[PDB]
Amino acid sequence: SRRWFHPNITGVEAENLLLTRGVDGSFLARPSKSNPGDFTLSVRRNGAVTHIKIQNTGDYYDLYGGEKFATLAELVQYYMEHHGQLKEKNGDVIELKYPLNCADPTSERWFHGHLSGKEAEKLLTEKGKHGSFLVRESQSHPGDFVLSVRTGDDNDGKSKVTHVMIRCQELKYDVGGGERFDSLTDLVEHYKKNPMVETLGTVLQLKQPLNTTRINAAEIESRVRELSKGFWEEFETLQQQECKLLYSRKEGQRQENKNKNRYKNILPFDHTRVVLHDGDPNEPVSDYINANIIMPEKKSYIATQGCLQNTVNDFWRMVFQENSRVIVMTTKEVERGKSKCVKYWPDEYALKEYGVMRVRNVKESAAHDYTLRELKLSKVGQGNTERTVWQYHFRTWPDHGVPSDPGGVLDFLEEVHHKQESIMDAGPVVVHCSAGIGRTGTFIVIDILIDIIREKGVDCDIDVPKTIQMVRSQRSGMVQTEAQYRFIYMAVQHYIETLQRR
Numbered sequence: 418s419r420r421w422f423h424p425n426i427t428g429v430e431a432e433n434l435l436l437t438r439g440v441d442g443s444f445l446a447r448p449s450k451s452n453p454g455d456f457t458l459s460v461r462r463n464g465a466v467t468h469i470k471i472q473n474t475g476d477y478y479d480l481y482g483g484e485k486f487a488t489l490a491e492l493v494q495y496y497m498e499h500h501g502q503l504k505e506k507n508g509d510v511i512e513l514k515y516p517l518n519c520a521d522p523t524s525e526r527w528f529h530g531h532l533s534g535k536e537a538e539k540l541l542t543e544k545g546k547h548g549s550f551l552v553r554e555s556q557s558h559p560g561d562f563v564l565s566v567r568t569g570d571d572n573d574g575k576s577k578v579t580h581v582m583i584r585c586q587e588l589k590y591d592v593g594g595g596e597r598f599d600s601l602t603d604l605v606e607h608y609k610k611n612p613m614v615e616t617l618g619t620v621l622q623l624k625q626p627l628n629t630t631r632i633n634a635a636e637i638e639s640r641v642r643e644l645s646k647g648f649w650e651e652f653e654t655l656q657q658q659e660c661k662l663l664y665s666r667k668e669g670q671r672q673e674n675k676n677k678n679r680y681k682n683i684l685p686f687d688h689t690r691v692v693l694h695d696g697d698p699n700e701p702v703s704d705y706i707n708a709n710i711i712m713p714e715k716k717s718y719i720a721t722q723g724c725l726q727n728t729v730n731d732f733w734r735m736v737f738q739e740n741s742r743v744i745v746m747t748t749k750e751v752e753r754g755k756s757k758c759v760k761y762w763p764d765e766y767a768l769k770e771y772g773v774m775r776v777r778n779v780k781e782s783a784a785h786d787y788t789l790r791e792l793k794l795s796k797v798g799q800g801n802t803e804r805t806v807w808q809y810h811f812r813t814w815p816d817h818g819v820p821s822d823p824g825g826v827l828d829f830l831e832e833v834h835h836k837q838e839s840i841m842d843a844g845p846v847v848v849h850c851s852a853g854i855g856r857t858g859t860f861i862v863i864d865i866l867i868d869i870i871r872e873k874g875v876d877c878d879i880d881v882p883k884t885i886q887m888v889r890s891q892r893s894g895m896v897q898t899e900a901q902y903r904f905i906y907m908a909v910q911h912y913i914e915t916l917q918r919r
């Protein structure tokens with residue numbers, strides 16, 4: 418499903434692959450070898466290869482002569498279902514027809530590379546469960562692989578670990594007979610669908626990879642130390658899982674809602690979008706905002722885009738309807754001379770009407786990294802609906818990449834948390850940047866992780882990529898870059914240290 422991404426290939430290897438194994442319309446994507454956030458889409462057209470740059474500074478994937486996207490899987494799905502839409506600098510059309518599959522197993526959750534049968538047995542015994550499995554290098558037979566599978570009752574002998582040898586002959590893979598596969602992923606997927614049955618009848622069911630990302634929070638420093646010499650590899654394994662999250666976005670794709678999206682292809686999932694009720698009867702579609710509910714799976718969030726001039730009223734309808742009392746803004750209104758969010762709040766001491774809502778800015782307070790605006794929101798014609806909405810406007814995030822130190826963000830998020838916790842029956846905390854996925858996702862995931870450690874103290878289990886995957890199932894592309902991914906680990910580490918210091 419995401420086999421067109423080749424994590425460890427060079428430009429010339431990509432060219433030769435497309436020229437010898439592909440046809441016109443063949444394509445693949447790959448990282449830049451030294452440049453994080455740069456990717457290349459390599460495509461074959463008229464017997465030649467073209468390389469198309471995709472940049473991601475933290476907000477979205479920006480395809481040259483194409484559009485902006487929330488994930489590379491969403492980018493490929495869009496253009497595979499939309500020909501004539503990707504053009505060269507000269508205007509000529511670049512068709513993405515045939516993904517060119519990668520055989521490299523390194524971003525599979527189940528692939529552990531160098532590892533002994535004894536090490537894999539203890540890992541499967543301590544962490545594993547029925548159907549927990551891994552693939553590793555053989556050591557006895559160089560170039561071969563072993564599949565190790567735990568099967569049993571959930572140390573009393575009711576469970577066991579089997580080792581199935583996997584031969585590699587002609588760069589095809591087999592388990593001793595039957596089909597020979599072009600890759601270990603194809604072998605795993607096959608024996609996931611069609612499990613091996615032993616002679617005495619044990620079914621070697623490959624239910625889940627062994628979890629290697631879950632850590633005890635107290636031991637965060639050791640995991641970060643280990644990832645710092647990696648973070649790229651762990652991030653790319655997470656990114657491989659995004660092909661499971663192509664959920665429908667049909668409401669955002671409606672003609673009627675086109676001009677309510679900051680970026681035409683960055684859309685909320687139908688199953689978690691905020692639906693706005695009590696709309697204008699004369700506006701035929703008034704139930705739409707580019708926003709999703711994010712539930713940790715007590716505090717929930719709405720992840721949304723920066724307002725457009727035509728969505729400011731809808732934004733306030735959302736805040737009112739959802740009973741939100743805290744907004745987190747993670748962008749300046751303008752960065753690099755581009756508008757990222759329209760000003761949707763009044764100047765200090767001023768009162769403005771936004772459709773049927775009225776907002777007073779009571780007071781602003783400037784801190785180093787942020788401005789707090791104390792806002793009063795009510796429905797026009799109904800005085801007893803007034804509530805305070807506290808807008809925390811983070812002002813010092815760099816235009817590209819992440820802050821060099823997480824202290825400013827953590828102090829900000831602590832103040833947000835206490836504000837939210839002090840307000841009886843407050844609704845979800847609204848979080849927004851520009852597209853509402855990169856910074857927004859980073860702030861939300863840090864908030865969710867810190868909240869676990871707040872309830873359960875320094876001795877609790879956290880699992881960063883599992884948390885991100887769960888949030889990504891609720892809005893597209895939450896947490897955009899490897900730099901945000903590392904920043905998340907650094908923020909949790911700093912949080913833990915300040916608590917051990919105390």
Ligand SMILES: c1ccc(-c2c[nH]c3cccnc23)cc1
Pocket residue numbers: 525526527628629630650651652654655658882883886
């Ligand atoms: C859910 C849980 C874990 C992961 C995961 C991200 N990087 C990984 C490296 C090795 C194994 N698993 C992972 C992704 C989704």
